[PDB]
Design a binder for these strands. Sequence first.
DNA 1: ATTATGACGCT
DNA 2: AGCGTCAT
Length: 430
Amino acid sequence: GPHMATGQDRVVALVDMDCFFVQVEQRQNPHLRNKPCAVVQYKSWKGGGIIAVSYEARAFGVTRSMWADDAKKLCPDLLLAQVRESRGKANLTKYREASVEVMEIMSRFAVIERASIDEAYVDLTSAVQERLQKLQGQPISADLLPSTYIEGLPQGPTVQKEGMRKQGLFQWLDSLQIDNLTSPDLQLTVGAVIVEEMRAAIERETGFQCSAGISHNKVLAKLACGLNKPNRQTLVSHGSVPQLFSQMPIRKIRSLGGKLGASVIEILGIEYMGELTQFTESQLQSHFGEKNGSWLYAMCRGIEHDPVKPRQLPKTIGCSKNFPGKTALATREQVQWWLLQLAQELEERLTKDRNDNDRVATQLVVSIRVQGDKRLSSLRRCCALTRYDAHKMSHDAFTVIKNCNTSGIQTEWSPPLTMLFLCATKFSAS
DNA sequence: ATTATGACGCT
DNA sequence: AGCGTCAT
Ligand SMILES: Nc1nc2c(ncn2[C@H]2C[C@H](O)[C@@H](COP(=O)(O)NP(=O)(O)OP(=O)(O)O)O2)c(=O)[nH]1
Ligand SMILES: [Mg+2]
Ligand SMILES: [Mg+2]
């Protein structure tokens, strides 16, 4: 009753760039704009592997993870941009720099948590309180929400998508009690006004379009963001959760798309997030552990407490390359040369990071995969990172991995290596 | 031969 | 510390 917390204390937004790498390439090359196009890494094997797809190309069935040759079968006029190659490997610098452009704009409005190269959470609670004081009980005009959808509306008592959007928005705004400065629905609405402004700023100052979700916590904001992509934002209220979750496959919620989500489905004999409400917190904890159980009990009611962390910069800086099938590294000279290539890219990125961000990494993590292992990493070993020198980093990585070499011969490497990975971690202020 | 990352939980 | 999971 009156003591049952409803998880309506915060206003949280999730901003995700639409087809990011594609937009970066379309800004640089206007010939790619408003066209079916995709971004690929490498080229020789099946035309390269697609990692980003414009919405025009998605209409033909083009997806991430698809080989470009296969994509061309679905979309013969598909245009392709290739990721830059440096020191024999894909180099993603252009997209990391474009990311910084966007994240610095977002940081003007509120503290953000960088969740990936193209998305960030925003805690708008305080900004919303400020705007509400400025409004002075003035109603919110639909003109202030020109790209906002209200999930679950319209309802009750009409052909085109924009007319649907506007009808739902008008139903929402008509039911708003702008008198109450602590109404959660009002707070969400003001949050959506601020996010319209943030997205306008991003597009004006970078040329990039994005989508966004506005809700009371990170998981609902993330889910909302995907409901109306591209170039739109969606508000998911606390009240919309029962209907939304009643037909929501468990796998659609962040964290449940893998083995745990499959176990929830299999053990409980359910399919949708809303079915979880029928179990007690102790029941869920008994199946999925104390932490997962409490999280599921709250999440199926729309409640989640994970804070937006004040963290605009990545916590690690890493360099990885796969060596599939017959390109695996089977000599010591090979392994040394590629450790050096990775280490040289890492040195360049670390030196730039130190100059920009006033910090130094102190730990080097070396991960490898050996032929036959189906795991991402076969082995992971750390050593100290005391100088930004690629030859030293690569020599140290070799020293910590050289005992994996089964070959009695000194020149050969067996079993051959199918992946190398260097990761700088444990940053300190400098 | 699905690649290149990044975050975070467990023990 | 080293390994596993999840995202994409
Ligand atoms: N290297 C690499 N980059 C990837 C991979 N997957 C994604 N990226 C890169 C390329 C992506 O552009 C970028 C952002 O990932 P999203 O937000 O998941 N996809 P997007 O922004 O394209 O479309 P949407 O409009 O649906 O949000 O991350 C991968 O497997 N490998
Ligand atoms: Mg995106
Ligand atoms: Mg994203």
